Amino acid sequence: SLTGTLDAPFPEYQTLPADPMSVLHNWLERARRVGIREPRALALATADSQGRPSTRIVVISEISDAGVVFSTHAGSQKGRELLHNPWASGVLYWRETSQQIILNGQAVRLPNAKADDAWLKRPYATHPMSSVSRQSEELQDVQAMRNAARQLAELQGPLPRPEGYCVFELRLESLEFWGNGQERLHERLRYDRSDTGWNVRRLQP
Amino acid sequence: SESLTGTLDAPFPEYQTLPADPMSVLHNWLERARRVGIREPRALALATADSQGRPSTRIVVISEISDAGVVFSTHAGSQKGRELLHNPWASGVLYWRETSQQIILNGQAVRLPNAKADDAWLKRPYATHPMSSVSRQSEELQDVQAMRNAARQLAELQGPLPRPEGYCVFELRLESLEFWGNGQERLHERLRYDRSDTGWNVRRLQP
Numbered sequence: 588s589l590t591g592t593l594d595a596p597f598p599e600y601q602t603l604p605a606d607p608m609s610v611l612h613n614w615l616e617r618a619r620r621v622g623i624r625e626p627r628a629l630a631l632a633t634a635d636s637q638g639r640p641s642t643r644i645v646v647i648s649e650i651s652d653a654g655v656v657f658s659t660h661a662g663s664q665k666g667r668e669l670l671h672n673p674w675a676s677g678v679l680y681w682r683e684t685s686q687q688i689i690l691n692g693q694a695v696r697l698p699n700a701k702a703d704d705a706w707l708k709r710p711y712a713t714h715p716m717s718s719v720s721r722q723s724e725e726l727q728d729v730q731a732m733r734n735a736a737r738q739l740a741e742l743q744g745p746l747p748r749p750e751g752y753c754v755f756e757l758r759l760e761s762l763e764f765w766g767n768g769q770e771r772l773h774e775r776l777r778y779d780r781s782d783t784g785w786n787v788r789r790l791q792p
Numbered sequence: 793s794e795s796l797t798g799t800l801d802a803p804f805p806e807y808q809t810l811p812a813d814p815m816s817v818l819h820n821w822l823e824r825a826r827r828v829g830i831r832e833p834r835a836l837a838l839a840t841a842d843s844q845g846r847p848s849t850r851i852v853v854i855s856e857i858s859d860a861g862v863v864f865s866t867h868a869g870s871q872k873g874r875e876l877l878h879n880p881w882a883s884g885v886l887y888w889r890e891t892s893q894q895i896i897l898n899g900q901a902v903r904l905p906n907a908k909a910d911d912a913w914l915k916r917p918y919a920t921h922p923m924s925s926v927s928r929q930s931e932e933l934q935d936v937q938a939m940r941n942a943a944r945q946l947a948e949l950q951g952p953l954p955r956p957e958g959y960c961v962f963e964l965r966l967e968s969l970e971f972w973g974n975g976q977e978r979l980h981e982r983l984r985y986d987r988s989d990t991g992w993n994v995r996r997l998q999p
């Protein structure tokens with residue numbers, strides 16, 4: 588099913604760099620240079636108190652020292668799940684280069700001053716709907732929501748940050764970099780955090 | 793900047809009409825994705841969870857849509873296979889950049905009989921058989937060249953091999969679905985289905 592047609596170098600599969608955050612930064616920078624479409628669209632999995640997963644796309648806003656950062660609403664399914672079970676996993680998949688990056692760890696809600704900054708960095712045209720919507724609750728009246736947001740759209744932004752608008756940091760415990768390789772020997776480079784740094788392994792395809 | 797790049801029209805009448813039977817909406821969206829040329833529409837980001845409820849994710853391909861859900865193949869000894877065998881609950885997401893559509897598929901995965909696995913294996917191009925035979929998916933790879941040389945020796949057959957132990961087919965039998973579209977004025981359109989005792993409950997969700 589693969590369709591990749593842009594160059595996809597994976598020298599790290601040979602050299603086994605010690606720091607997977609450096610690999611992550613370099614893969615993302617390469618993705619930006621070669622023009623991958625929506626490279627930061629992360630399929631993010633959380634799980635409820637029974638261990639049942641749920642998934643959705645979120646956008647990675649930043650790569651931090653400990654992992655990756657995204658924004659969402661605290662009262663959404665993902666926010667409620669993360670509040671009780673911080674473990675999460677996300678995958679980036681770039682069709683053009685046949686590459687995946689899998690990111691596993693614990694996601695921690697950051698303080699309100701970080702949320703305030705993230706909110707002000709969103710285009711102000713986003714503020715009305717984000718203010719009126721209680722993400723993932725049932726929507727009883729579509730027109731009423733549309734009209735309330737239109738009222739707020741008439742203002743000069745920015746609007747106040749809504750209470751539940753929050754930023755999570757996914758602090759990584761493991762990562763995998765996947766490339767298509769040659770001869771169906773797909774190339775899998777797996778990192779796991781240790782007490783003192785990171786361990787690295789190749790995995791069978 | 794907002795990150796959506798989609799520009800293709802993506803009709804979502806079902807958000808207005810609330811069909812009682814969500815598999816018809818799945819079929820409608822996948823057929824349109826095929827007709828308009830969405831790239832790899834069946835690449836599913838599939839989440840499973842370990843014995844402590846810690847999720848893991850990877851892409852798999854949806855091979856078929858069944859009456860109860862969607863079907864994919866994998867190795868039983870992989871991380872996803874070992875997780876599913878202990879905890880059948882899974883969730884997957886399809887995301888189509890070109891139309892700004894997402895499909896979220898939640899349910900329980902059931903391993904299908906070996907006869908089904910045999911049929912799926914034989915439907916794969918036989919060029920895929922050597923590596924799938926020698927690789928113990930997700931175990932540590934200690935010698936890349938040894939695995940390469942082994943698979944090359946099997947590839948000399950130039951014909952189908954027996955199905956390997958552990959090559960398996962799962963059906964994700966759905967208990968809930970969501971269809972997400974970009975909508976108008978950032979009122980993203982979220983159509984959520986949950987199985988009921990008889991049929992399905994359908995709701996719209998706030999974006």
Ligand SMILES: Cc1cc2nc3c(=O)[nH]c(=O)nc-3n(C[C@H](O)[C@H](O)[C@H](O)COP(=O)(O)O)c2cc1C
Pocket residue numbers: 628641642643644645646647657658659660663664665666722723795796887892893894972999
């Ligand atoms: C490409 C794309 C990017 C998205 N980015 C985010 C995001 O960063 N944060 C967010 O809360 N929702 C984002 N969404 C909406 C989510 O996919 C989802 O509908 C929402 O967060 C509610 O998920 P939940 O009900 O599982 O918690 C995005 C959707 C798409 C299609």
Ligand SMILES: Cc1cc2nc3c(=O)[nH]c(=O)nc-3n(C[C@H](O)[C@H](O)[C@H](O)COP(=O)(O)O)c2cc1C
Pocket residue numbers: 588589685686687765792835848849850851852853854864865866867870871872873929930
């Ligand atoms: C586009 C794409 C499709 C894939 N399809 C499958 C598949 O259908 N079944 C499978 O076992 N692995 C598939 N893989 C490989 C998986 O992403 C993954 O590496 C492998 O299943 C091991 O996952 P696990 O260690 O989490 O169990 C695919 C990879 C890509 C990039």
Ligand SMILES: O=C(O)[C@@H]1CC=CC2=C1N=C1C=CC[C@@H](C(=O)O)[C@@H]1N2
Pocket residue numbers: 588589773792853865866867920923924
């Ligand atoms: O061929 C494809 O479309 C995908 C792409 C890459 C990897 C991949 C694919 N499909 C698989 C189906 C079953 C198990 C596995 C294998 O070959 O052993 C496998 N992996």
Ligand SMILES: O=C(O)[C@@H]1CC=CC2=C1N=C1C=CC[C@@H](C(=O)O)[C@@H]1N2
Pocket residue numbers: 646658659660713716717793794795796980999
């Ligand atoms: O703007 C983007 O790139 C994405 C695309 C689509 C939906 C979406 C996006 N980013 C969000 C960030 C925080 C919460 C949520 C919101 O606006 O309330 C949100 N939703």
